[PDB]
From a paper:
Substituting His/Phe with Ser/Ile should expand the substrate-binding pocket to accommodate the bulkier substrate PET, and the strategy termed “double mutation (DM)” has proven to be useful to enhance PET hydrolytic activity of several IsPETase-like enzymes. Here, we report our experience in establishing the P. pastoris strain that expresses a PET hydrolytic enzyme from Caldimonas taiwanensis termed CtPL-DM that was identified from sequence mining from GenBank and modified by the DM strategy. In contrast to the protein expressed in Escherichia coli, CtPL-DM expressed in P. pastoris is inactive in PET degradation. Structural analysis indicates that a putative N-glycosylation site N181 could restrain the conformational change of a substrate-binding Trp and hamper the enzyme action.
Residue numbers in the entry: 24 to 202, 210 to 230, 233 to 239, 241 to 280, 282 to 292
The structure:
Amino acid sequence: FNPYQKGPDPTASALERNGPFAIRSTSVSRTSVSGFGGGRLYYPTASGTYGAIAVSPGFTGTSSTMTFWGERLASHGFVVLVIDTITLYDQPDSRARQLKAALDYLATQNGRSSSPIYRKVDTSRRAVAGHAMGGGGSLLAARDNPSYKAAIPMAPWATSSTAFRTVSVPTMIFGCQDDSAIPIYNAIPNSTRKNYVEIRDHLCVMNGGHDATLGKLGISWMKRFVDNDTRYSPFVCGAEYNRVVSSEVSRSYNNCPY
């Protein structure tokens, strides 16, 4: 009995579409929060306590460019806050701090009976994700906050790959072959559970056309690590992953099994 397990036993097709949790979304206003630029909160309406995921857009990106991830993750049983940055021009380090703020905001809101997500978040199970500089942001957050359960940097950008040589959070990186992501993956300690999947734009991961495959891989990673849902092992390490990776995928690395 995994107490964090949610949703039906997984299938490829169910992971290639919006999931079985009905979700609502609300706007988090800039005026309500000091540590980030507000954003879009997606949450399963169904009773329960869920893992919390904060997702960063990249450089000049808005929460609206990442709504795919809000809906896709939340609809498979996560509370997902797609942040807007304090400015469009915020660097990775600032995106990292804003992702950490967004997760702390989710923990604070969890405890307020005023909040639609009152008692809906397991504040012990947090993950980060983001696109480009938001990817670098997610990975810096995960570096600084090893209690986090998972990171998914998608087309990650940073000024240094050696910055990630202490990452201790299970990290799935998405690459777009015709775009940095590999030096980042190589820098992560091989003692850290990690996975690289290269799709064949820079915004091939952004709201992209490989939505099916990237969504499946991403939900699977959050399930496996945020929920400890070993039902998804076939989808991140086993026969299903190997099917995905063998097809659309130019290259993949991992240190499977986990």
